[PDB]
RNA sequence: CUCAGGCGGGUCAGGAAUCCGCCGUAGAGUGCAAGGGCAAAAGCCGGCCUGACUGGACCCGUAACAGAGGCGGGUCCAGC
RNA sequence: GGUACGGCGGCCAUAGCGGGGGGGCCACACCCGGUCUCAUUUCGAACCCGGAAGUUAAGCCCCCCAGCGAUCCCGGUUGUACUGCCCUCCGAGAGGGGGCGGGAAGCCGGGGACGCCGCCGGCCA
């Protein structure tokens, strides 16, 4: 696994058309909804990036496992809904290099990543009042796994920002 | 890889019609007439394949200097050279 | 079966005679599934039964399970219209018992049934055209103002009001002949 | 229409009145159009010229005016009436000063011996110079009305009720179905005298 | 003349043989890649034909602007 | 000059799809019958020919609608996204910013919209 700083930035054009990309790998993350999506919840904690960035599927899966384990241990399966809103479409390639360097250097697919704009939500955890601290801790744990600065916000059912109200209360 | 210019090279969007304009065009453009010295725009109609000039000249404004058969003789200034084209009136539009 | 709109339909037909349904056509098909002597026998049989030259319907796409090929004649078809069609439909409906199952009327009142053997109005198991009997008969109905959707010049569309339905087809077929069963 | 990509045809195409490809082919000539149309009971012949804002009919002739003026009690949807209308429109065009025209039958199929070609023959005999080929003209006996009188006689010989149902309106109008060629000849002579 | 696909109804007959009705903007087809164009057609089904011909003119492209042997294409005059 | 009459057209959905009510001096149709003209790879179903027994049920003509499609105007998102020129402006980088000039798409709310126009003829007056 090469360092994520290589694929962190978004200066390259979008590379997603599976009809023309030869040898594109299959996704490594297959679960995007956990908990009880049907049940309603008063509050939702969303995680946003502070800058445009490509987040790898490995980082997405690691954050998913960590947050899901924490929420299962502390809150309970029927008391939360954890969702990842983004899907890895960008295909990350690498130059395949006896041996010729820089000759015919177009890369072959090696992984997948999700490209995100500025202030775009990555994941959401829907909980009630009594599990807000656990939701915030899970959001922080997820943010610790990503290659960019991230911040959390709290929204009510109507969609208004109430993070300051909730944290002060 | 260098690619030589052809008649239909890189004309995917230039020579494509609107979905609501598919089919035969109205006959006014087909039957329109011009006088010598009149200035006309070149708007190629993709459905009509007769008397079509090179798509490189699509969108340019020329002057009518004659008429041969059913096609009009249009003069354009490509750089400093004078270029003569035989364009069907369906591919032409009057200026103003 | 039972049609709750019986008297309403009858009153509507009486009030507006041009809304009364009529037989568009009667189509008789025999899908012998092979080309040769049996197909010729079926064609001769249809010629005697109807009185007009039938049509050899060929095969669409090649299927090897049935042993058929593209362009090879397969079935035989005849279409009849007018009083001749009325008389032949009377004969064909009297062939089987004058009973039609409820689950056979189309969404527009047209019907399709089948006659397996030659137990019908006059016929014989003659040495030629023997065993090729067995047909499916489809009756297509129509209201007088139906030429609009079929003509070329000034063609238009028929509204749902003027289009027929299953209940009206059953009522017309009752007023003509036969009966319906709850199957 | 069920989407942005749906292509709604021209209004005349939707109404099933104008064949635009044949219209373009006819208009490419640049000559007046002798438009011939037929209904269940009448015939229409017009001389039309092209204009970008809408075609202009210089000369028009409707077969209903044969009932008045000259006087014609025959059915106005048959070959003799078509021939009379063709003669009328040809004489009207010659009076107006139009010397050449090209036939336009619209959506009517080109079946030889039809009423549209009867109108064409009538215009040609009137004097209008319309390019054509004589092989498509209806037979002279059909133009005069021999077939109508022949069927009238056959029906009269056969069941008289069939004849009454076939030609009931002729009796009410007061014209015997027989001698219809004679009536047609009288009307033709009257028209020729009026326009010559 | 109108396609692909779908729905409802039919003797053997079924997922699939042939047939009736309706919806059906082309989701079919157009010899072969892709793009563009085509619905009273450029698609499918038939009739009649050889203009896939002869003697020539001008113009565009390869090769923008800006030079070109060879080649391809377009607009026409005449003959049959 | 009138007409809930027709023919040929222009723009080619703000004009289409789908619904409700009314109408036939004339005219347009449905409709009646296949000797003759014409045709079925069968069928007068289409096309064609000869007509007026019946019908305004519908094609058509007149009035209305906003469910779908389309599209014009106004207000919000919003001078938001994006962007031309200059810069000794900040930023580790990614990128951003100041001055002057332009400026969306989509979505929400309220209206519009079930076409407009040209030539001629028929009937009545």
Query: How many Å apart are CA C52 and CA C84, to the nearest integer?
Result: 11
Q: Are A50 and A149 in contact (CB under 8 A)?
A: yes
Q: How many CB atoms lie within 10 A of CB D125?
A: 16
Neighbours, chain B (3 or more CB pairs < 8 A):
D
Give bridge partners of residue B68 from the DSSP assignment. Answer: B71
In three state form, how does the secondary structure of chain A look?
CCCCCCCCCCCCCCCCCCCCCCCCCCCCCCCCEEECCCCCCCEEEEEEECCCEEEEHHHHHHHHHHHHHHHHHHCCHHHCEEEECCCCCEEEEECCCCCCCCCCCCCEEEEEEEEECCCCEEEEEEECHHHHHHHHHHHHHHHCCCCCCEEEEEECCCCCECHHHHHHC
The alpha carbon of residue C22 is apart from the nearest alpha carbon of chain D, in Å, by 23
**Tokens at residue A148, please?**
């960019």
Torsion, Cα of C11, C12, C16, C18 (10° steps)? -120
Span CA (B52) to C1' (E57), Å: 20
Query: How many Å apart are CA D177 and CA C61, to the nearest integer?
Result: 57
* CA torsion through residues D160, D163, D169, D173, sign: negative
**Tokens at residue B37, please?**
């010295």
> Three-state DSSP class for C27?
strand
Tell me which residues of chain B have a C-beta less than 8 Å from any C-beta of chain D: 19-24, 26-28, 30-32
* Nearest nucleotide to B26, CA against C1' atoms: F12
Contacting residues of D for B27, CB less than 8 Å apart: 20, 23-24, 27
Query: How many Å apart are CA C143 and CA C165, to the nearest integer?
Result: 11
Tell whether D97 lies on the interface with B, counting CB pairs under 8 A.
Answer: no
CA atoms within 13 A on the CB side of D6: 5
Experimental approach: cryo-EM
Tell me which residues of chain D have a C-beta less than 8 Å from any C-beta of chain C: 15-17, 107-108
Contacting residues of D for B32, CB less than 8 Å apart: 52
Whole-angstrom CA distances from D82 to B30, C108, C157, D163 are 34, 42, 31, 24
Tell whether C156 lies on the interface with D, counting CB pairs under 8 A.
Answer: yes
The closest of C31, C49, C28 to C129, measured between CA atoms, is: C49
Contacts of A106 (CB under 8 A, 6+ apart): A93, A95
Please list every residue in chain D followed by a chain break, i.e. its C lies more than 2.5 Å from the next written N.
none
Positions 105-134 of C with beta carbon below 7 A from strand E are 105-108, 110-116, 134
Query: How many Å apart are CA C155 and CA D128, to the nearest integer?
Result: 33
- Protein residue minimizing CA–C1' distance to F29: D40
Q: Are D149 and D178 in contact (CB under 8 A)?
A: yes
Residue of chain C whose alpha carbon sits nearest to that of D106? C153
Is there contact between C29 and strand E, defined as CB under 7 Å from any strand atom?
Answer: yes
Query: How many Å apart are CA D16 and CA C152, to the nearest integer?
Result: 8
> Three-state DSSP class for C126?
coil
Contacting residues of D for B30, CB less than 8 Å apart: 24, 28
What resolution in Å is listed for this PDB structure?
2.6
Give bridge partners of residue C12 from the DSSP assignment. Answer: none
Distance of CA A96 to the CA centre of its chain: 28
Across D64-146, the runs of DSSP E, i.e. the strands, are 102-104
Residue B39 has φ and ψ, to the nearest 5°, of: -100, 130
Say how many CB pairs under 8 Å bridge B and D: 29
Q: What strands, in cross-sheet order, belong to the sheet with C55-58?
A: C55-58, C73-80, C22-30, C135-142, C111-115
Query: How many Å apart are CA D190 and CA D140, to the nearest integer?
Result: 19
As ranges, strand F nucleotides with an atom below 7 A of a protein CB are 6-13, 15-20, 26-32, 35-38, 41-55, 57-60, 68-71, 93-95, 115-123
> Three-state DSSP class for B83?
strand
- Please, is A89 exposed, middle or buried when counting C-beta atoms within 10 Å of its C-beta (0-12, 13-18, 19+)? middle
Contacting residues of B for D9, CB less than 8 Å apart: 23
* Nearest nucleotide to D67, CA against C1' atoms: F122
Contacts of A88 (CB under 8 A, 6+ apart): A27, A29, A56, A57, A60, A112, A113, A114
Query: How many Å apart are CA C69 and CA C72, to the nearest integer?
Result: 6
Q: How many CB atoms lie within 10 A of CB C2?
A: 7
Contacts of C20 (CB under 8 A, 6+ apart): C13, C143, C144, C172
> Three-state DSSP class for D116?
helix
Contacting residues of C for D17, CB less than 8 Å apart: 153-154
Q: How many residues does chain D have?
A: 196
Contact D17 C154 (CB under 8 A): yes
Torsion, Cα of A44, A47, A50, A54 (10° steps)? -140
Query: How many Å apart are CA C57 and CA C76, to the nearest integer?
Result: 6
Query: How many Å apart are CA B49 and CA A76, to the nearest integer?
Result: 70
Span CA (A13) to C1' (F44), Å: 68
Contacts 24+ apart (CB under 8 A), B60-68: B61/B95, B63/B37, B63/B38, B63/B39, B64/B34, B64/B35, B64/B36, B64/B37, B64/B38, B64/B39, B64/B40, B65/B36, B65/B37, B66/B36, B67/B34, B67/B36
The closest of C175, C179, C4 to C100, measured between CA atoms, is: C179
The closest of A120, A154, A122 to A135, measured between CA atoms, is: A154
Residue of chain C whose alpha carbon sits nearest to that of D39? C153
In three state form, how does the secondary structure of C81-125 look?
CCHHHHHHHHHHHHHCCCEEEHHHCCCCCCEEEEECCCCCCCCCC
Query: How many Å apart are CA D47 and CA D68, to the nearest integer?
Result: 22
Tell whether C147 lies on the interface with D, counting CB pairs under 8 A.
Answer: no
């Amino acid at each position: 696994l090469r360092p994520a700083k290589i694929d962190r930035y978004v200066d390259k054009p979008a590379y997603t058309r599976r009809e023309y990309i030869r040898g594109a790998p299959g996704p490594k993350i297959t679960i995007f909804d956990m908990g009880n999506p049907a049940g309603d919840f008063e509050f939702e904690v969303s995680l946003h990036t502070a800058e445009p960035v490509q987040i790898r599927q490995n980082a997405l899966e690691a954050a998913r496992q960590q947050v899901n384990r924490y929420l299962q241990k502390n809150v309970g399966r029927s008391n939360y809904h954890f969702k990842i809103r983004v899907y890895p479409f960008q295909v990350l390639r690498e130059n395949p290099m006896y041996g010729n360097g820089m000759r015919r250097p177009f890369g072959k697919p090696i992984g997948l990543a999700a490209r995100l704009k500025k202030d775009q939500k990555i994941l959401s955890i829907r909980v009630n009042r009594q599990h807000l601290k656990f939701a915030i801790e899970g959001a922080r744990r997820a943010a610790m796994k990503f290659p960019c600065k991230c911040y959390y916000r709290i929204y009510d059912k109507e969609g208004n920002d109430v993070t300051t109200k909730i944290l002060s209360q | 890889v260098q690619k030589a210019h052809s008649f239909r090279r890189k004309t995917r969007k230039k020579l494509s019609k609107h979905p609501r304009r598919r089919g035969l065009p109205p006959l006014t453009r087909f039957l329109q007439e011009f006088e010598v010295g009149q200035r006309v725009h070149i708007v190629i109609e993709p459905s009509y394949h007769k008397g079509m000039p090179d798509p490189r000249f699509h969108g340019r404004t020329g002057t009518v200097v004659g008429k041969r058969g059913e096609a009009y003789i249009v003069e354009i200034k490509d750089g400093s050279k004078v270029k003569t084209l035989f364009i069907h009136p369906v591919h032409l539009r009057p200026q103003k | 079966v039972e049609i709750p709109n019986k008297e309403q339909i009858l009153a509507d037909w009486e009030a507006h005679p041009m809304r009364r349904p009529r037989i568009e056509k009667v189509t008789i098909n025999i899908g012998v599934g092979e080309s040769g002597e049996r197909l010729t026998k079926a064609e001769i049989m249809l010629q005697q039964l109807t009185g007009q030259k039938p049509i050899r319907r060929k095969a669409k796409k090649t299927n090897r399970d049935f042993g058929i090929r593209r362009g090879e004649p397969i079935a035989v078809k005849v279409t009849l219209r007018g009083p001749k069609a009325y008389e032949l439909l009377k004969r064909l409906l009297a062939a089987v018992d004058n009973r039609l199952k409820a689950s056979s009327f189309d969404e527009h009142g047209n019907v399709c049934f089948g006659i397996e053997e030659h137990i019908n109005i006059p016929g014989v198991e003659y040495d030629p055209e023997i065993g090729i009997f067995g047909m499916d008969v489809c009756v297509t109905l129509e209201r007088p103002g139906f030429r609009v959707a079929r003509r070329k010049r000034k063609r238009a569309k028929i509204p749902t009001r003027h289009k027929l339905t299953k209940e009206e087809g059953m009522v017309y077929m009752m007023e003509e002949f036969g009966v319906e069963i709850v199957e | 229409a069920h989407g942005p990509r749906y292509r709604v045809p021209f209004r005349r195409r939707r109404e099933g009145k104008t064949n635009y490809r044949k219209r373009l082919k006819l208009l490419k000539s640049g000559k007046p159009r002798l438009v011939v149309r037929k209904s269940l009971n009448h015939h229409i012949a017009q001389i039309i010229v092209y204009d970008p804002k809408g075609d202009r009919t210089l000369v028009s002739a409707h077969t209903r005016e044969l009932i008045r003026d000259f006087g014609w009690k025959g059915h106005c949807g048959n070959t003799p009436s078509a021939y009379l209308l063709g003669l009328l429109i040809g004489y009207k065009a010659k009076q107006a000063g139009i010397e050449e025209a090209i036939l336009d039958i619209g959506l009517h199929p080109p079946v030889r011996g039809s009423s549209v070609f009867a109108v064409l023959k009538g215009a040609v005999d009137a004097g209008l110079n319309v390019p054509h080929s004589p092989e498509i003209f209806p037979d002279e006996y059909r133009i005069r009305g021999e077939h109508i009188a022949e069927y009238a006689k056959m029906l009269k010989e056969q069941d008289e009720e069939k004849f009454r149902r076939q030609f009931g309106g002729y009796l009410v109008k007061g014209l015997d179905p027989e001698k219809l060629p004679e009536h047609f000849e009288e009307v033709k002579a009257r028209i020729i005298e009026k326009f010559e």
